[PDB]
Each structure stands twice: as C-alpha cells, then as structure tokens.
Amino acid sequence: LDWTKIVSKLGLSGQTAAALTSFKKRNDEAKRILFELKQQPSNVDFAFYKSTLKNTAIVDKIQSDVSKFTPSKANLSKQLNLIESFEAKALENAKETESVVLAELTDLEKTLENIESXXXXXXXXXXXXXXXXXXXXXXXXXXXX
C-alpha cells in the first residue's frame, strides 16, 4: 500500500514531485469526506410535521417527493482519460525494461565470470567485456545527469 514506496517511485528527476503531491492530497481528502458524512439517506420526520403545519396536505406532499429520487452531481466512466494512459505508460516503462534492464543483468554476469577466469584465450574475451563495463560506468553517470 506504498508513503515509503509511493514517494520514492520517481526517478532522478524532480519533475514528478508536483504530480505525486497532488494525487496524495486528493486521495486523503476523498476518504475523509465519506467518513465524516452520514452513510444513510435522511430522517424526514413526517409524523410530527403533518400535524404541526398550518397548511393542510403540506408536509405530506413534500415527504413523498423527497423519498423518491432526485438529481445529484455524479458522472459516468465514459471519460476514461486516466485508464487509457495507464496502458500506454507501461509500454514505455514496464515493457521497456525487458530489453534495457534485462540486458544489463546478462552482460554483468558474463563479464564477472570472464574476468575471474582459460588463460590467454579467456583474457581475449575478458578484454572485450572490460571495454563494455567501462562504457557502462560512463553511461551510468550520464543517465543520472
């Protein structure tokens, strides 16, 4: 359900600080509005209102119309702007890690076994892995900048 992992979900850029703060404030205010309000309709004490009013058939007609149905500020799920954006963002971030993040793990395992191991023949394969490891270290500083 993660303040511990929800705030650290962004990368090295600080541009996602405004979007993360707006989503957390709207989610906290949504649960506080439903808990502070009553989870029922209305009382409508018609037993003490029809016998106390001066006008005849006044409180009886207003109680039947209020207990039926009325309008409210609601909306439907037709404008699914955030639902369509979740599938497109995962194709460029979650699906993109299968060829970028997974390729770095396979190259790191082959470079560690070749640099730690037969003699002159294994040194030639470790020489090419050393150049790729040195280029990855320089690209790591550019990716964070």
Partner 1 sequence: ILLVTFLGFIALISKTVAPLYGEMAKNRTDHVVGLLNQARADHVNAVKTRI
Note whether 112 binds partner 1 by CB under 8 A: yes
Please give the span between the terminal C-alpha atoms of the chain, in angstroms, as a whole number: 30
Cα angle 41, 47, 50 (rounded to 5 degrees) comes to 105
- For the bound state, the minimum distance from the C-beta of residue 100 to partner 1, rounded and expressed in Å, comes to 10
Site string for partner 1, 89-108 (x = CB under 8 A): ------------x--xx--x
User: Cβ closer to partner 1: 62 or 107?
Assistant: 107
Note whether 128 binds partner 1 by CB under 8 A: no
Residues in the chain: 145
CA 29 to CA 51: how far, in whole Å?
Answer: 42
Burial class (CB in 10 A: 0-12, 13-18, 19+), 108: middle
* Residue 79 main-chain phi, psi, to 5 deg: -85, 75
Residues touching partner 1, count (CB under 8 A):
13
Note whether 134 binds partner 1 by CB under 8 A: yes
- For the bound state, the minimum distance from the C-beta of residue 101 to partner 1, rounded and expressed in Å, comes to 7
- For the bound state, the minimum distance from the C-beta of residue 7 to partner 1, rounded and expressed in Å, comes to 19
User: Cβ closer to partner 1: 122 or 136?
Assistant: 136
